[PDB]
């Protein structure tokens, strides 16, 4: 019965793998030249996030990143490999924006640590047997998310507006893309296999695939095609 997996969403997973991989190879066979030590950081950071995502999407495709969790009434398919990805992916995405706005080490740590809680709490939620409690973890995860998005929006903007026109402009486009994409994750989770079965794992997988590739490669293509602070 149970929210069928290991087979339907294979195309989505495979397609995720393809885009992440090509996006990786792209950022690689583009960062060939790049002298500027500042620009060097952005290329490095932004190339690892596709590579992490490639590794993890492969595991889901090949089955390894799938597991079964007892909840609600049945044997529920869960892709923990998402949290393995996101654990390192989402802090690096933050580090790009931190570096771009030259944020204080204080905020950076507060940020990365908070992101740590967001994903960790998410995984605890995803694997929690007791149905009712999954939403306790979702709420906490969403609090960690909205905190991060707050400092990005109401914080990092002001600091950005004081940099260079290019930096303020570039940060803002990214800030927009980030706030929007990130805010989708708790929604698609809550309606998906992982929470209330409004929407099947099949669509849950597809939504996350589109969101993920946008938040890795789409995000990266805004950044690595602009003036990356002093550098290019
Ligand atoms: C490339 C992947 C990205 C940018 C992933 C972002 C992930 C989040 C913003 C996750 C948020 C979550 C919630 C707020 C609730 C349920 C648990 C999470 C981790 C899925």
Curated annotation (Swiss-Prot):
It is a multi-pass membrane protein. Residues 30-43, 97-107, 155-172 are cytoplasmic. Its main location: membrane. The modification Pyrrolidone carboxylic acid is found at residue 1. The chain crosses the membrane at residues 10-29, 44-62, 80-96, 108-127, 135-154, 173-191, 204-223. The record marks 85 as: Primary proton acceptor. The covalent binding of retinal to the apoprotein, bacterioopsin, generates bacteriorhodopsin. Residues 1-9, 63-79, 128-134, 192-203 are extracellular. InterPro entries: Arc/bac/fun_rhodopsins, Rhodopsin_retinal_BS. Keywords: Cell membrane, Chromophore, Hydrogen ion transport, Ion transport, Membrane, Photoreceptor protein, Pyrrolidone carboxylic acid, Receptor, Retinal protein, Sensory transduction, Transmembrane, Transmembrane helix, Transport. GO terms for cellular component: plasma membrane. The modification N6-(retinylidene)lysine is found at residue 216. Pfam families: Bac_rhodopsin. One of its GO terms (molecular function) is light-driven active monoatomic ion transmembrane transporter activity. Light-driven proton pump. Homotrimer. Belongs to the archaeal/bacterial/fungal opsin family. This is Bacteriorhodopsin. It comes from Halobacterium salinarum (strain ATCC 700922 / JCM 11081 / NRC-1) (Halobacterium halobium).
């Amino acid at each position: 019965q149970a929210q069928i997996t290991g087979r339907p969403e294979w195309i989505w997973l495979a397609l995720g793998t393809a885009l992440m991989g090509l996006g990786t190879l792209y950022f690689l066979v583009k960062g060939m030249g790049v002298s500027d030590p500042d620009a060097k950081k952005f290329y490095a950071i932004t190339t690892l996030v596709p590579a992490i995502a490639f590794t993890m999407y492969l595991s889901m495709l090949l089955g390894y990143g799938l597991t079964m969790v007892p909840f609600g009434g049945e044997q529920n398919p869960i892709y923990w490999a998402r949290y393995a990805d996101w654990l390192f992916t989402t802090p690096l995405l933050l580090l790009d924006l931190a570096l771009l706005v030259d944020a204080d080490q204080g905020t950076i740590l507060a940020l990365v640590g908070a992101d740590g809680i967001m994903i960790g709490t998410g995984l605890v939620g995803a694997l929690t047997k007791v149905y009712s409690y999954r939403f306790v973890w979702w709420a906490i995860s969403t609090a960690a998310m909205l905190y991060i998005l707050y400092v990005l929006f109401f914080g990092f903007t002001s600091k950005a507006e004081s940099m260079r026109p290019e930096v303020a402009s570039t940060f803002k486009v990214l800030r927009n893309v980030t706030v929007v994409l990130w805010s989708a994750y708790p929604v698609v989770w809550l309606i998906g296999s992982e929470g209330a079965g409004i929407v099947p794992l099949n669509i849950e997988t597809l939504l996350f695939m589109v969101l993920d590739v946008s938040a890795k490669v789409g995000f990266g293509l805004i950044l690595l095609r602009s003036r990356a602070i002093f550098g290019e």
